[PDB]
Amino acid sequence: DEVARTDEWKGAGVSRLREVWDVQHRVRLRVLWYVNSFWRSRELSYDDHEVELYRALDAYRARIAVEYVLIRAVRDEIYAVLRRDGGALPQRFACHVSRNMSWRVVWELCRHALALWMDWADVRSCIIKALTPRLSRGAAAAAQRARRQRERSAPKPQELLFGPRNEPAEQTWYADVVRCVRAQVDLGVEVRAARCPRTGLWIVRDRRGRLRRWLSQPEVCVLYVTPDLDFYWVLPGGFAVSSRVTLHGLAQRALRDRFQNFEAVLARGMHVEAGRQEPETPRVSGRRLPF
């Protein structure tokens, strides 16, 4: 007689049903422990040091602390740019504004909006969703190719006529919307901006050209980030604060391990070529017999 290993594994049965948690105390999960697994026959030990746990919690503190030290460096850049211009901020956004209105209240409302935005920072925010397309696979090559293409010589008539022909007035930003009076900080939203060609200012819109109308309201403020690390803090009245988001205080591998953009792996119902229209999802559901 020769009994197979899968027969003993099936007739083994689980010893006991354990259940554990995570660090943040958010997700519990249940773990089996089979008796005839090869985990028993390895003869391994367990050395739970205390300073190893200390350094592990230090590395965990760094891993949580990536985006939050990025947000605090953002806030330092807000205050630094507000000081280095002396507080005489410029207007960079197209909005009809008045003069016969006391602007004493809007500065206090902008400070309160900054404080309430810093009260409600989150992993679903402006700078992280602006950094994720930069963190992609071919974003560096596309960025340097855009750098080489924005810097070209004068168009000679020889290459103008007989040479190959030449080839983006709309940008897809990201925004954090703070509602100061009702105290509802809206965390992360897409927005699409353009240069309104009557003047040299910006206009923001939704996915259907809706012309986002919060900037008329004195109750709200917004933060804009672009995929070229630009920073636009906007209070009502169209006056803005423009700067660059810093990254010198962050590790490269911290940005890699925290929010790296993912590139796809092949599976069923997916085209071998990329950039095509896909078929339906697998969707093994509890509505159908599994056919």
């Binding site: 000679k156 008539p157 020889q158 290459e159 006529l161 007989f162 040479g163």
Partner: protein, 49 residues
């Protein structure tokens, strides 16, 4: 039965190509009213055709 008798003249993108192929000559700009008797041996844009 040599593959080449003038490597400055028989390769794509050579000296006499960029001097005498008319497709390369349009990218440099020239008097099209001038006649060049060498270009009839270098107009591979239509020798293929």
């Amino acid at each position: 039965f040599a593959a080449t008798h003038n490597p400055w003249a028989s390769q794509a993108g050579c000296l006499s190509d960029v001097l005498y192929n008319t497709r390369h000559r349009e990218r440099l700009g020239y008097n099209s009213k001038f006649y060049s008797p060498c270009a009839q041996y270098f107009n591979t844009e239509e020798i293929i055709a």
